[PDB]
Amino acid sequence: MDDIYKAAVEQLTEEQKNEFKAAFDIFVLGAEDGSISTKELGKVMRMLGQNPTPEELQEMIDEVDEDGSGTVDFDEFLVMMVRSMKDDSKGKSEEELSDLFRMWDKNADGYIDLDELKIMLQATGETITEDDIEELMKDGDKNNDGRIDYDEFLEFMKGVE
Template sequence: EAFSLFDKDGDGQITTKELGTVMRSLGQNPSESELQDMINEVDADNNGTIDFPEFLTMMARKMKDTDSEEEIREAFKVFDRDNNGFISAAELRHVMTSIGERLTDDEVDEMMREA
C-alpha cells in the first residue's frame, strides 16, 4: 500500500518526480539532487528508479535511522491538523487527497480500523 502511494502512475517504479510529490506532501522540500541521491542509495539495478524490492530496502534503512522516531512524530503532525494528538478520519482523508489518493469512506474506515 505504501509503495502505491509513491508509485502514482502504477508502473511499478518510483521516479524522482513521484518521490518528490510524496515528500512535499509530508512537509519536506528536497532538491532534485537530494531526491536523486535517495534513489541512488537503493537503486540496485541502476535504472534511475525504485522498484518494490528497492523500496523495501529504502524503508528498512529509514526504520533503522537514529532519528526515525522524530521523523515519525513530524509525519504524524502532518496528519494531525488540529494538534489534538489523534488522527481523525477527516484528517486522514485530507492528507491522502493532498497526495492524490482519492479514498472512499469504506477505505478510510478500513484504514482507521487497521490503525
C-alpha cells in the first residue's frame, strides 16, 4: 500500500519536509545515516505530542513490514507521518488566521478599517507617505463593501504571507 500514501505525500506541503528533517536530525543526532528502528517508530510519534500506540505497531510489521527490513528509512517515515493524518477532526488554517485577525483588529468591532490597515506601516517600520494608507485600502476595498471582512482579510495575507 504505497499508492494510497503517494496521493497524500504528493498533495502534502513543504511543512512535512521541515517537520521531517527537524525530528529526523534529533534521532540521527547529526550522523551519516541514522535509520530509526521499527521498535522506536512508536516513540517518534509520542515525541511529536500525541497519543500513539506502540502496541499496534508490532502488529503491523508482524503481518507486513512494507519492505521487510526492520528499520525506518526516509520514505518509510514520510509515509507513516501522513499515514496517521488520515481520519482526523482537526486540520484547518483558520486557527492560525485567528491570530492575525486579532493583530489587525484590536478594539471591539471585528473588522479591518482604514485605521486598522495603516497598522501595517508599523508592522514593517516606516516608509511611503499617507498615500500608502489610502492606496492599500483602495486595493482591498472599493469592491462594494466599504470595509475588510475576515474572508477578505485572511485572503489578502494568504497571498503574501
